[model samples]
Target: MSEETSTQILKQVEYYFSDSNFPRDKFLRSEAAKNVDNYISIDVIASFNRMKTISTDLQLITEALKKSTRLQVSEDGKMVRRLDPLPENID
Candidate 1:
């Protein structure tokens, strides 16, 4: 994908909001990727073609970030790692 297209896709997708999750697992690296079948097969590089899609790439990280509601050890303890809800991760 082109840089412009990636930015557009990222900006335009449903992940641009909170309380959302992707239905499918992200493609992984494993022996399965090396398999070859004798029948016709096709795959999509992205899921937006599914007509219906849901998910966020940052879920695990976002969950941890949200729970970091702690105060920094300092004279005036003003901040810690508490992360706010970003559009990508809500659920």
Candidate 2:
């Protein structure tokens, strides 16, 4: 929705990759582990319901994700990953 802001985008994406969610999100957890750097494709994220609600534009999502400290985006802006791995207890 247009009511959504970049702040919402940041929070949602961060939470998806956060310690609290990452360990429990089976699909994303597996996807994050697919590559050496643990990058999950932005294309995958953009398909998320909440993400689609906010905006599906890759550049918009990439820019919003840049504000996150808990997540990082690839140089080409095609992927995202947690800045750190899930805690020992969670993993």
Candidate 3:
């Protein structure tokens, strides 16, 4: 949605991941870091909300038939895998 590329966002996720150290500290100190964080988080949030809306719509009919299918966002986002469900579907 934003002008900055996913490459930009992914790098922020990586750069900040190394810097944050989790549970403490902030990797979002630099200007680009802060900008990327906000922009990336906004997209994540927007996508999350859209998914939430779909989920809720699924609930309404009590049915929109929310289905979980295997798909990748983009070429770079695709992971190498075989014909199988994700690990989370192990339930």
Candidate 4:
């Protein structure tokens, strides 16, 4: 993809996570961690939608995940790795 496209996608991702109603922290901490690869695959599709490249199905699902407090991203951007330590836990 072009640099502009990449930048746009990153912006969309940032906007998606900016919503206070979006429960990004939870998704990053779920049992899905065991299947991070799968989660990232789904996230790629969702990310496409966030960038407005694909249809909205993935966007809807992402929004739902956020609203339900079940979506998250790694603070250090180390997604889907097997050996990375988890982020600090909060109550």
Regarding lDDT, does 1 or 2 come out ahead?
A: 2
**Order of candidates by lDDT, top first?**
2, 4, 3, 1
Candidate 1 on 7-80: residue-level lDDT in tens? 33333332322223222323311211343211111122132353123223333222222232221112222211
Q: Write the per-residue lDDT of candidate 4 for residues 60-81, one digit (tens) a residue.
A: 4444333322235444232322
Q: Which residues of candidate 4, in runs, are more than 4 Å off?
A: 24-48, 52-91
Candidate rank order under TM-score: 2, 4, 3, 1
Angstrom error at residue 11, model 2: 1.1
Q: Say which prediction, candidate 1 or candidate 4, comes out ahead on lDDT.
A: 4
Model 1 stretches with alpha carbons more than 4 Å out: 14-45, 50-84, 88-91
Tens digits of per-residue lDDT, candidate 3, 1-91, equal 1222333333333332343332143322332253332222323322334333533332321111111122122222212111232233221
* TM-score for all models, in order of appearance: 0.22, 0.70, 0.23, 0.33
lDDT, model 1: 0.26
| Whole-model Cα lDDT of every candidate shown, in order | 0.26, 0.66, 0.27, 0.39
lDDT, residue 78, candidate 1 = 20
Q: What would the per-residue lDDT of candidate 2 be over residues 2-70, giving only the tens digit for each residue?
A: 325666787777766554676677667767778743678777787777787776676667677665556
Which prediction has the highest TM-score against the true structure?
Answer: 2
